[PDB]
Amino acid sequence: FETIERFMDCRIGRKGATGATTTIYAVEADGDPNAGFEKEPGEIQYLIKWKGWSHIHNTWETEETLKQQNVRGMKKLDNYKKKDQETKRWLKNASPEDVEYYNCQQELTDDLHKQYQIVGRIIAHSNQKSAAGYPDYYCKWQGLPYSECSWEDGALISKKFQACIDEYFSRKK
């Protein structure tokens, strides 16, 4: 039973464009299920950061998929919505200036959050290896304190951060 730790973003995309198939590693390996969204009529989907899972594992989810999974943390979906509403009402009529800020000052965070998904540095690996021969890697995420490091699947990482891997073992001498 999973837990909603944080609501990272909010969008509207193809119906069905939710879950595992929506992670960045799945998307990179198979394309975006929300692919080139738009004529398409959509759904309200939330980008969610999970309890005990790295940001690299976030996934888009609709208030429904959430309930369908019995995830814990639903309370959070209400606050988020109540908060999102509070924001708008307060920014209905703001200077265009107020608006520029909001859009800049929000693109900043938008871009920041993405970093958490990229390995700034691998700092240790496992003595045990998958049947494929991949060890797991303790990864240090871009933008987050070492208290946020974590063990990630060897194969998963290698698909996109083989450098950090290569440069991790290279650093041994």
Partner: peptide, 5 residues
């Protein structure tokens, strides 16, 4: 290990 499988 552990991804979203």
């Amino acid at each position: 290990a552990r991804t979203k499988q």
